[PDB]
Design a protein around this ligand. Structure first.
Ligand SMILES: *[C@@H]1O[C@H](CO)[C@@H](O)[C@H](O)[C@H]1NC(C)=O
Ligand SMILES: *[C@@H]1O[C@H](CO)[C@@H](O)[C@H](O)[C@H]1NC(C)=O
Ligand SMILES: *[C@@H]1O[C@H](CO)[C@@H](O)[C@H](O)[C@H]1NC(C)=O
Lengths: 229, 145, 303, 173, 232
C-alpha cells in the first residue's frame, strides 16, 4: 500500500509540472529533485525485493520483470542528460503498477486480453503490414517531384498510418494524384483505394474480432459450465 | 426513378444479394427502437445546445451551415458530429470566451459567448454516449442478423 | 382516508383475432401511458420551436404547451401516488431510476413554470434550470416497454464499460503527463511563419486568409493572395496545448476521436521535432485501434 | 475644434488643430509630442517652433497615414468579400469592426498619447476591441498549420498584454 | 510450401537492387528515375521472416476450408458493397450536377479568375432564385467553368459522371470529407435532396454495409474456433 501511495504521489507531482514561463531552470528545479527522490525510493524498493526473494527468485516472478525494466529506465532517466527525453516514457509508465489495487480490474484486463499470444500475433501482423505497405509506397513515390509525403521512410510511414486512421486519407490520395499526373493517376488511385479498403475492412475488423474472442468464454469452459446446469 | 426502382429490384434475383438485403432490413427493424433512443438523446442534447450555444459568434466551423440557432440546425449538427465531422473545432468555437466575445450582464441570448465548461461537458458526454456506445449496439445487431 | 383511492387504482390500470399484433400493440400500455406519451411528444414538438429569439417565456403558444404538460404530469403523478403509494409499496411510483428521473423532471418543470424568469444570464441558475428542463424527452425512455428493455440491456454492461473507461483514462493520464513534461510551452510560436526567434515577434505583418481548400487556382502572374495585416503574436494553437494536465487530457481526448489529429501531429513535428511524432503515433495506435475496439468488444459481448 | 484636414505640408508648421486625411484623430501636436520618425528623429515638438525638418516630418507622417489607409483598404476589401458579415454576431456590426480596426491601425502607425480625449482607454486595448468586434476569419494553413488561431489575435502564451506606459489614446466606438 | 521459387525471386530482386545501386554509385542516373520501383518486391522478403509462424495445430485442409469460406463471404459482401455504391452513385448523378457555380464579385471577366474574385470563404450557389443559397448584393452566381477553370484544380470531388460520383460516394462512406460535400450540395441544390441523400448514404453505407465486413470477420473467427475445437 505504501508503494502504491508513493507511485501515486510521484506521478501526481510529475504531471503537475505545468508551464510557467521561459525564466525557469527546469534542470535543477524542485520537480527534478522530487523525481530523483522517488527514483531513489523505487531503486531501494527493488533492491530490497531482490534481496528478500533472491535475484533469481525476483526475476522468476514473470511479472516483476516489467517493474525491473521501469527501475532501470527511471535510473537512466535520473541523469540530467536523459532528463525530459524519450526515457521519461519509462517514468510515466510506473502508474501501470497502480493496476494492482483492484484484483477485479486485473482479472478484467487479463480476460479482455485473453490469450496474449493471439493479440500479440495480431499486433505483430498489423505492424508488419504497415511496414511492408510503407516501404512499397516509399519505393513507388520517392522520385515524384513536388511531393513531400513519400520522400523519406518516416514520412511514408506517417502517410500510410494516416490513411489507416482514415483521417484525411482523401487528402493524401489527392496530393498523390496531383503529383503523378494523368497517365499514372488511375493506377495509383486504384492502388490507394485497394489499400484503404483492405485497411478499413480488414485490420479494424480483425481487432474487433480478436477482442470479442478474448471476451468470449472458452469453448471447453462453456461446455463445463453447461454441464453443471 | 423507375430505372432506380428496377435496379433496386434486381437485388432479389441474386441469392447472396437477397440474403444480405434481408439481413440489412431485418437488422433495421430490430434496431428501430435503438435508433429511436438515439434520436431521443440527440433531441435532448439539441435542446440543451440551443439553450446554451444559440447565439455563439461564428468560429472555425460555426457558420450559417453548422450552428445552434434553431432546433433543426442543432439536430443536424449533432447528427453530423458523430458521423465524421471536426466536432472538436465545433466545441472549441462553442468554448469562446471574452475578450473574443462581448459579454452581456442581463440575458443569455445577447451575450454572443459560450459556456466553456458547459460546452466541454456537453460535447464530450454526447460523443461518448453516441459515437462510443450505441453504435456498437448497432454493430452487434448487424452481426446477429 | 381510504375511499376513492380504489377509484384511482382502477383508473390507472385500464388497458386494451385476425390482427392479433395490432390488438397487442394497441393494448401495449395503459391509457394513462398513452396520454402521458402524447403530452410529452407535444411538449417536445413545442420545444422544437423554442429558438433563442422565440423565447418560451414570451411566446404564448409555448407557454400554453408548458402549462398543459405540467398540469397533466402533476395530475398523473398525484393519481399514481394516491393509488399505488410512493415508497412502502414495492411496485409504487418510486421503484427504480425511472421514478426518480420522472420526479426530477416534474420538479424542474414545476419550478420553471412557477418562476418564469424574464432575464436569463449566461452561466446562471436560470440557464441551468432551462437546460435541465430540456431533459424532458427522457420520459419516453420510461413510458415504453421496449425502451426500458433497451436501457436495461445497455446498462447491464455498465461495470465493463466503466472498467474500459478506467483503462482509457489511465492511458490518457500517462500520455498527458508525458506531453506536459515534454511540451510545456514549446508548442507556441509566432503566427508569422517568416519570423522565427520570439524576440522578433512584434509589429504587424500581412497574413493570407483561407478561401477554399478544394481549389488550386495557380494563375498568379503578378497578384498576391487575399489577406490583411494583423499583429505578430507568439501564441498557442488555441485548439490543443500542453500548458497543464487538463489541457493535455482534453487534447488527447480530442485526438482519440481521430478528428483533426493530423493537425496536432504536424504541429508537434514542426514545433518540437520529428522524433516526438513517435509519441502521437503510439498514442493513436494504443487508443484508437485498441481502446475504441475495447469499447466495441465489451458492448457487443454484453449484448 | 473645427475640421482642418492636412493637405499641404509646406502650408504651415493652435497646433492641436490639424486632422490627418485618414487617421483624423491625430494632430501635429499629437504627433510631435513623443513620436520620432527614424529618418528625421529630431521632431519632438521643439524643432517645430524653430523649416526643412518640420516639412520632412509632416511629409513622413502623411506617408505613414497613406500606408495605413492602403492597409485599411486591403482589410475592408477582405471584409467586404465576407458573406456572413450580417450573421457572425448579434452584438457586433461590420461597421464597428471597421472602425475599431482603423483605430488599431492608426495606433500601430502612431504610438503616442492622444490628448483632449473625453473617454480614456489604453491604446493597445483597441486590439482586444477588434477581437471582440471583427468576425473570426480563418487564415490560410498551407505553409504551416496554425491550429485554431484566428487571423487577428492580440495576446500570447504567458504574456502580459496590458503594461505600464500605455499610450492610452482617444476612445471612439 | 513451394518456397524455392519465392527465394529465387527474392535473390533476383536482390541482384537487381545491387546493380541499380552500383549504377547509382556510377552517378549515371541521378536516382530520380522510376528505376527505384525495381525495389518494390524487396520488402516482400519480410514475408520470409514469418514463414515459420504460419503453421498452427490446424491441418492444411481445415485452414484451406476456413479461408475458402471467408473468401466467399468477403466476395459476396464486396458484391453487395459494389451494388450499393453503384446505386448511390446513380442517385447522386441524377440528383446533383457539377459543384461549379460560385458567388463571385459581379465585376468578373472570363479567363480572369482570381482568388480575390471569390468570396471569403468561397461558397457555392445556384442561378435559380429559390434553390440553394443566394448570393448577397455585390455577388452573383457564376458557372466558374466557362471562366477557364480546369478539372485538375477541381479534382475528383463532385458528381460529374458515374465514376466521379462512385468515387465520391466511396469517400463519403469512410466518413471523410462529406460534411463539406453536404454543405456544397445544400448550397447548389434544394436542401431536402441533400439531407435525404447524405443521411441515407451515411446510415446505410457508413454504418450497415461497413459493419457487414466486421460481421463476416466474426463469423470467420467463429469458424476458426469450431475447427480448433473439432480437431480432436
Ligand atoms: C501568402 O502567399 C504568398 C504566395 O505564396 C507567400 O509568398 C506569402 O509568404 C504568404 N504569406 C505568408 C504570411 O506566408
Ligand atoms: C483581369 O484583372 C486584372 C486585375 O484587375 C485587370 O488589370 C485586367 O484588365 C483584367 N483583364 C480582363 C481581360 O478582364
Ligand atoms: C456590383 O454590386 C455592387 C453592389 O451594389 C454595385 O455597387 C456595383 O455597381 C455592381 N457592379 C456591377 C453590376 O458591375
Amino acid at each position: 500500500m505504501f508503494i502504491l501511495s508513493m507511485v501515486t504521489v510521484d506521478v501526481i507531482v510529475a504531471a503537475s509540472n505545468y508551464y510557467k514561463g521561459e525564466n525557469f531552470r527546469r534542470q535543477y528545479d524542485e520537480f527534478y529533485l522530487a523525481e530523483v527522490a522517488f527514483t531513489v525510493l523505487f531503486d531501494l524498493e527493488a533492491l530490497l525485493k531482490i534481496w528478500c526473494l533472491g535475484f533469481t527468485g525476483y526475476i522468476s516472478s514473470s511479472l516483476h520483470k516489467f517493474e525491473l525494466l521501469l527501475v532501470i529506465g527511471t535510473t537512466l532517466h535520473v541523469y540530467p542528460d536523459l532528463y525530459h527525453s524519450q526515457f521519461t516514457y519509462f517514468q510515466v509508465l510506473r502508474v501501470v503498477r497502480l493496476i494492482k489495487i483492484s484484483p477485479a480490474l486485473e482479472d478484467f484486463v487479463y480476460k479482455i486480453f485473453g490469450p496474449g499470444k493471439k493479440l500479440g500475433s495480431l499486433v505483430v501482423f498489423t505492424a508488419s503490414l504497415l511496414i511492408v505497405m510503407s516501404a512499397i509506397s516509399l519505393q513507388m513515390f520517392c522520385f515524384v517531384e513536388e511531393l513531400d509525403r513519400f520522400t523519406t521512410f518516416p514520412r511514408a510511414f506517417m502517410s500510410m498510418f494516416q490513411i489507416l486512421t482514415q483521417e484525411g486519407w482523401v487528402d493524401v490520395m489527392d496530393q498523390t494524384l496531383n503529383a503523378v499526373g494523368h497517365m499514372w493517376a488511375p493506377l495509383v488511385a486504384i492502388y490507394f483505394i485497394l489499400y484503404h479498403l483492405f485497411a478499413t475492412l480488414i485490420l479494424l475488423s480483425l481487432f474487433v474480432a480478436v477482442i470479442l474472442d478474448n471476451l468470449e468464454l472458452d469453448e471447453d469452459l462453456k461446455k463445463l459450465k453447461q454441464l453443471k446446469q | 426513378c423507375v430505372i432506380v426502382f428496377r435496379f433496386f429490384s434486381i437485388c432479389g434475383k441474386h441469392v447472396t444479394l437477397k440474403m444480405l438485403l434481408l439481413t440489412v432490413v431485418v437488422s433495421m427493424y430490430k434496431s428501430f427502437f435503438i435508433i429511436v433512443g438515439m434520436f431521443l438523446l440527440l433531441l435532448c442534447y439539441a435542446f440543451a445546445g440551443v439553450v446554451l450555444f444559440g447565439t455563439v459568434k461564428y468560429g472555425e466551423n460555426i457558420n450559417r451551415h453548422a450552428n445552434f440557432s434553431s432546433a433543426g440546425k442543432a439536430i443536424t449538427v449533432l447528427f453530423r458530429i458523430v458521423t465524421g465531422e471536426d466536432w472538436n473545432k465545433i466545441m472549441h468555437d462553442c468554448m469562446v470566451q471574452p475578450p473574443f466575445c462581448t459579454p452581456d450582464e442581463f440575458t443569455y441570448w445577447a451575450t454572443d459567448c459560450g459556456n466553456y465548461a458547459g460546452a466541454l461537458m456537453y460535447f464530450c458526454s454526447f460523443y461518448v454516449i453516441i459515437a462510443y456506445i450505441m453504435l456498437n449496439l448497432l454493430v452487434a445487431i448487424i452481426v446477429e442478423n | 382516508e381510504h375511499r376513492f383511492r380504489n377509484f384511482c387504482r382502477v383508473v390507472v390500470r385500464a388497458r386494451f383475432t385476425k390482427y392479433h399484433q395490432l390488438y397487442d400493440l394497441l393494448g401495449l400500455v395503459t391509457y394513462l401511458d398513452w396520454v402521458m406519451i402524447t403530452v410529452t411528444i407535444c411538449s417536445c414538438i413545442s420545444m422544437m420551436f423554442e429558438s433563442p429569439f422565440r423565447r418560451v417565456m414570451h411566446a404564448p403558444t409555448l407557454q400554453i404547451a408548458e402549462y398543459v404538460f405540467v398540469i397533466f404530469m402533476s395530475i398523473e403523478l398525484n393519481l399514481k401516488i394516491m393509488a399505488d403509494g410512493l415508497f412502502f409499496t414495492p411496485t409504487a411510483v418510486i421503484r427504480d431510476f425511472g421514478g426518480v428521473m420522472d420526479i426530477f423532471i416534474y420538479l424542474v418543470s414545476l419550478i420553471f413554470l412557477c418562476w418564469m424568469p424574464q432575464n436569463v444570464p449566461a452561466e446562471s441558475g436560470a440557464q441551468l434550470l432551462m437546460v435541465l428542463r430540456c431533459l424532458r424527452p427522457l420520459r419516453i425512455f420510461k413510458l415504453v416497454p421496449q425502451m426500458r428493455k433497451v436501457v436495461r440491456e445497455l446498462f447491464s454492461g455498465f461495470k465493463e464499460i466503466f472498467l474500459v473507461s478506467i483503462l482509457l483514462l489511465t492511458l490518457m493520464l500517462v500520455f498527458a503527463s508525458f506531453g506536459v513534461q515534454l511540451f510545456a510551452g514549446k508548442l507556441a510560436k509566432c503566427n508569422d511563419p517568416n519570423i522565427i526567434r520570439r524576440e522578433d515577434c512584434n509589429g504587424i505583418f500581412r497574413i493570407n486568409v483561407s478561401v477554399s481548400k478544394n481549389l488550386n487556382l495557380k494563375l498568379r502572374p503578378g497578384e498576391k493572395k487575399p489577406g490583411f495585416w494583423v499583429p505578430r503574436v507568439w501564441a498557442n494553437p488555441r485548439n490543443f496545448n500542453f500548458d497543464n494536465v487538463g489541457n493535455a487530457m482534453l487534447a488527447l481526448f480530442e485526438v482519440l476521436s481521430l478528428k483533426g489529429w493530423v493537425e496536432v501531429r504536424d504541429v508537434i513535428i514542426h514545433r518540437v521535432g520529428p522524433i516526438h511524432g513517435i509519441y502521437i503515433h503510439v498514442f493513436v495506435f494504443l487508443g484508437c485501434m485498441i481502446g475504441l475496439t475495447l469499447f466495441v468488444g465489451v458492448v457487443i459481448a454484453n449484448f | 475644434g473645427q475640421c482642418f484636414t492636412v493637405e499641404s505640408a509646406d502650408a504651415v508648421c493652435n497646433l492641436s488643430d490639424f486632422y490627418l486625411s485618414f487617421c483624423n484623430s491625430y494632430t501635429l501636436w499629437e504627433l510631435f509630442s513623443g513620436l520620432s520618425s527614424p529618418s528625421t528623429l529630431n521632431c519632438s515638438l521643439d524643432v517645430v517652433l524653430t523649416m526643412t525638418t518640420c516639412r520632412q516630418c509632416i511629409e513622413a507622417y502623411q506617408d505613414y497615414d497613406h500606408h495605413a489607409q492602403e492597409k485599411y483598404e486591403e482589410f475592408e476589401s477582405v471584409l467586404h468579400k465576407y458573406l456572413q458579415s450580417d450573421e457572425y454576431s448579434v452584438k457586433s456590426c461590420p461597421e464597428d469592426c471597421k472602425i475599431v480596426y482603423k483605430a488599431w491601425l492608426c495606433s500601430q502607425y502612431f504610438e503616442v498619447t492622444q490628448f483632449n480625449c473625453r473617454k480614456t482607454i489604453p491604446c493597445k486595448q483597441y486590439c482586444l476591441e477588434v477581437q471582440t468586434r471583427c468576425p473570426f476569419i480563418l487564415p490560410d494553413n498551407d505553409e504551416v498549420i496554425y491550429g485554431g488561431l484566428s487571423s487577428f489575435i492580440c495576446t500570447g502564451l504567458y504574456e502580459t498584454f496590458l503594461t505600464n506606459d500605455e499610450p492610452e489614446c482617444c476612445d471612439i466606438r | 510450401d513451394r518456397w524455392c521459387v519465392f527465394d529465387g525471386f527474392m535473390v533476383f530482386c536482390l541482384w537487381v537492387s545491387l546493380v541499380l545501386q552500383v549504377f547509382e554509385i556510377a552517378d549515371i542516373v541521378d536516382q530520380m528515375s522510376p528505376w527505384g520501383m525495381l525495389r518494390i518486391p524487396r520488402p516482400l522478403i519480410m514475408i520470409r521472416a514469418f514463414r515459420i509462424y504460419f503453421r498452427f495445430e490446424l491441418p492444411r485442409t481445415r485452414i484451406t476450408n476456413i479461408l475458402k469460406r471467408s473468401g466467399e463471404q468477403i466476395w459476396s459482401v464486396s458484391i453487395f458493397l459494389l451494388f450499393f455504391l453503384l446505386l448511390y452513385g446513380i442517385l447522386g448523378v441524377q440528383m446533383f450536377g457539377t459543384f461549379t457555380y460560385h458567388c463571385v464579385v459581379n465585376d468578373t471577366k472570363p479567363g480572369n479568375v482570381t482568388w480575390n474574385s471569390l468570396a471569403i470563404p468561397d461558397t457555392h450557389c445556384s442561378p435559380e432564385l429559390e434553390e440553394g443559397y443566394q448570393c448577397p448584393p455585390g455577388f452573383k452566381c457564376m458557372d466558374l467553368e466557362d471562366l477557364g477553370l480546369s478539372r485538375q484544380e477541381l479534382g475528383y470531388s463532385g458528381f460529374n459522371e458515374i465514376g466521379t460520383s462512385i468515387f465520391t460516394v466511396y469517400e463519403a462512406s469512410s466518413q471523410e470529407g462529406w460534411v463539406f460535400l453536404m454543405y456544397r450540395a445544400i448550397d447548389s441544390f434544394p436542401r431536402w435532396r441533400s439531407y435525404f441523400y447524405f443521411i441515407t448514404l451515411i446510415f446505410f453505407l457508413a454504418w450497415l454495409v461497413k459493419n457487414v465486413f466486421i460481421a463476416v470477420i466474426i463469423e470467420t473467427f467463429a469458424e476458426i474456433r469450431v475447427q480448433f475445437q473439432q480437431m480432436w
